[PDB]
Amino acid sequence: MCLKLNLLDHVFANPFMNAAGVLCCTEEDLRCMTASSSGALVSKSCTSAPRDGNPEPRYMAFPLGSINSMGLPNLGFDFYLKYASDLHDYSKKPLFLSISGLSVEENVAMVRRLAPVAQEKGVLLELNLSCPNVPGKPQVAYDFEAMRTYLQQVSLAYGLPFGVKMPPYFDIAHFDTAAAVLNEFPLVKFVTCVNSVGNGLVIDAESESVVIKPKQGFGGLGGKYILPTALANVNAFYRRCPDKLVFGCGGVYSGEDAFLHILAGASMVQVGTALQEEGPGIFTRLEDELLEIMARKGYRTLEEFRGRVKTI
């Protein structure tokens, strides 16, 4: 038994990949992810120009997960585009390129240049509408009219299939509205749920201090803290977007957590905090653990249980 699957006209050895931003900023990082046993990889969310990002310390991990305010430190779109066009070995695994412009115009500029490389190489766009860490830049997908504008303009400029990295929602009406906006756009072929639970605050009791420097300590949460939130979002969008794929992201540390994401509706399963903490060895463990659970339950394929979470 193997975990191989086909999605978006690509073949994947297994459903696992890094979450955008983790182990994917430099050429070294991307080569490392490519050498790993992951089924795919995604690059660091990029901007038109290189960015230093927010002041350090800007990432901290704890038993229950992580907090960060990276601020989109990245080598610039030119680099990630070059990686996709010239450097990536597509024989190894598919590549997603994440973009996170600070305006609709910036995203449009990037996708116009990405299009020919997508046409030639088959790199897949993940449009980030949920960066919660750039000062003065609210999460785009929390403003439904802004989200519609971004998707209209990107759809028109790109003209090719793409996906969207979504923030978590916490309100049924918001699931309804957000999914309806996404459903307006036939080029949106996948929906990645979720980005960090935004603007949490970790405080150290001994020092009586916040643990990250940017934004007075306020940063995106990932890891164990967010698994039920992530599962809810995966399932909410799976139910509401029956003609799209949902990629699960949030709180994956084990094959069991991945199994839950897939039960909720996930096609691919992304790994952030746990990968940052454990390193790329995690991918062999996740594959082994997922296969073990499947074997115990008598499941032979991912399709046998994807989206088959039971209700009472």
Add this chain to the structure above:
Amino acid sequence: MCLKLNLLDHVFANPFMNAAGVLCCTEEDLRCMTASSSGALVSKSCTSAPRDGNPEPRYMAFPLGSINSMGLPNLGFDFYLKYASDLHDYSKKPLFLSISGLSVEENVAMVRRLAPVAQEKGVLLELNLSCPNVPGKPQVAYDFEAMRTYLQQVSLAYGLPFGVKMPPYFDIAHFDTAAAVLNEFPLVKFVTCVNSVGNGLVIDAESESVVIKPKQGFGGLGGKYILPTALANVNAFYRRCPDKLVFGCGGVYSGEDAFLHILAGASMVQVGTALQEEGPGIFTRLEDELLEIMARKGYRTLEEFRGRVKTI
């Protein structure tokens, strides 16, 4: 060294109280909370008429917290008003009465009748604008115009100091807007941050099923999952509402957790999931643990460290 507080023209032996909804639905529950070592208690969020609530199972707890979709089961406003008027021993500790009408009209109806009892007895209103569990009723305070309408109408009909139970927010722009709305209302004297992290989804791996029955398993999250979210909201509103009090709620299991809430700006500290799981003995433990931390740090009163979280 002492945990005493004097706020809202009341005296509190310590900052601890139940979170609304936990151990506070029946007369038995309220007498139990009154007999406990807590500094105060709050009644179950009530509606004009009694409610059975959502179908069971509707509460489930786990190592990292709880999920619920109770659906405002309550004995009805008449009962809680009678409790405040005739039954509560105010010589023991202050009482808060939580209301959660399903419309602005229902809330107005209740506060008109509460006002003379508040005037006579000193019962304190907590207005719930963040119930995430009634099917078809989105969280009021996620709609800023609805929130303003509710606060305008309740302010006019009630005419007395009250507080508001707020949902967690996850974006800086939302903290900014929400706090600005609250600041329009001089009668809002306290802000309780936070209600449950709404519409999470816990799935049991063995049974492949959601763990609660209502809303296809979607329920409010509390406990360890939500502490950094709760701290962020407490601090965000503490910073933005310098002329109001902030009550902390979310993820409190220990005196250390309470210490963090207080550093973030909390006056009272409410305990939900941990109280539901441990029972009212938790209050003596929380008091001992908070006093221990204060002793180690040389703090003699809560005011010496309230809101004194350090940034980098």
